[model samples]
Target: MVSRLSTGILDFDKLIQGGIPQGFFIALTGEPGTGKTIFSLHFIAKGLRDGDPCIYVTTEESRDSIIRQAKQFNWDFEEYIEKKLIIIDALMDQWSLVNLTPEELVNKVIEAKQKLGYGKARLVIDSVSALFLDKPAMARKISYYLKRVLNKWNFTIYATSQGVEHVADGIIRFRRMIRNGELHRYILIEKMRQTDHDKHVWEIDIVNGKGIVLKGRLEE
Candidate 1:
């Protein structure tokens, strides 16, 4: 039987079939302002509280920015960092990242995984889109290799990606759409490798105290 790992969001985990398989990886893709950061933070927060170590790789935001934002949610990432419970790396400037070859750039995550473990670890990369800003070929290569390496490491990763090609065994897409002139948030489980997931554009509410809530489907 395949094992499971909590995504931190209880209902979300249920939708993905109890939880993600152990050592499996996912791409948390969404448009801007769709609560990607909050989702990632809550995922990491849950893992820490559950006795799991984490490695958070921030590609777009700075380490300080992530802390301040998580603070707004009342998450003390400071304690996690200073206590060595989590590793947060403010990796790669836009300039450097865009210029690096796909092989070199994707290796950055490999290095982080090496440090995080040869066992269970929760790793998140906020905004994988930045790495492929204007490079589609590079994007494909990056996407392909990221999955390969993560699987090899056996680390459960929830990489917050953007509107792009898939780079994981599963994909949880966050979307914000204007419905009848009103903005609505929706989440779609595009593909889940080994589990039966809800196949619909599920409505979501990004609320305080509750990171992302799974309401019913949009088509319902």
Candidate 2:
């Protein structure tokens, strides 16, 4: 029996069996400024709203930075932080992360997991890419170990990356391209395990205070 939770965006949920499958390791990839971080904010926002604790490991932003970003979308990350419903581990030191071994990083996350103490919390590693900043080829192997350890503790993992993570159970890719000389953004479920996920390229808009909104398929 596979349970699911909402992706936090209503229209987007309609395309993915009502939400993401529980305890599955999901990889969310996209180019810079393609709303990858905001998407994870939605996932965490939804989880915290539903009484599920959340853990955010951000390699690219500070704790306050993420909270401020979520505030723009009207998601009260501070309130959740105050309630201990969320923990943001900000690895903003680029130099440190570059030399941080995958094992040490995993241990750091385990420490956060213990602090959250919620067995079924939703975990977001916002940019697993940065965690392995200098180890491109080793991302796959490390992800497998990361997935097994995190999933064993019952966390539904959602990692953001600038590149694809082929080992993830689901890979949601966001893209931005010029259409008719206008800048446009799109999203696709590149891969998902144990489900017939949507494969269409849906146009998306990142509105202030609203986050990502699906605007249906890109008819061309």
Candidate 3:
């Protein structure tokens, strides 16, 4: 059976089948200013509440920036930090384009897992797209690395990706490829390895101070 991890947002849990599976990669993709960062924070916060340690790896923002943004939602991340329930800013020092390689980035994630003592812990990669900006060819390789690391660490992961802009041909491709298909029209469940998951396109909307709400589903 696939273990599920909550996002700490009640309505979102009602949409997925008991929430995202543990030890698997769950991608949260949406347009800019669509609450993706908040969603990720909520996921990590849920882990902290559940007595599980978590690591937040960011490429686009710093630890302080994220914490400041979280404050807007009244979430005090400093408490979690003090309790050692969460580790923030895994990639702050190496976010530079010249410093990070695909393998290096993945290794940092693995090292953070070791430092935090994985097992029941959770992992959050704020946005992979933001990192390795010039290395579009590394997507598949990075995906492979992510899967391997998550399996080895046994962590429930929530990773975010920037949305694809609307194009003239109406061809929606992820990371400039059509391999796993596009989530543009709906809430796409990209890949959930080792889980008996339901793959569907569902409607999603985020409410300020309330979090994401599934518009269609009544029950799992």
Best by lDDT: 2
lDDT of 1: 0.70
In model 1, where is the ten-residue run with the lowest total lDDT? 92-101
Instruction: Encode model 2's per-residue lDDT on 1-220: one tens digit a residue.
Output: 4798899998888888888899899999889888899999999999888888787877777777888999999998877663545454555422133345667666666666676675577888887877577878788888998898888887898988883467898989899988789989999998888778888989999999999999879655
lDDT of 1 by residue, 1-220 (tens): 6888887778788787778887766787877789888888887887777767676767777777877887777677787673334444445332124343445545655665555555577777676666677775676677667667766766687777662345577887888989789888988888888889888788888776556787776675
Residue-pair clashes per prediction, in order, are 0, 0, 0
Q: Where does the lowest 10-residue lDDT sum fall in candidate 2? A: 90-99
Identify the runs in model 3 with alpha carbons over 4 angstroms from their true place: 82-98, 163-205, 215-220
List per-prediction Cα lDDT, in the order shown. 0.70, 0.80, 0.60
Off by over 4 Å in 2: 93-99
- Clash pairs (backbone) in predicted model 3: none
TM-score of 2: 0.90
Q: lDDT tens digits, residues 33-112, model 3?
A: 65677778778777876878777877677788888876666666778763434444535443223345556656666666
Error of 3 at 205 (Å): 4.7
Among all windows of 10 consecutive residues in model 3, the one with the lowest summed lDDT is 164-173
What is the lDDT, from 0 to 100, of the residue 7 in candidate 2?
A: 90
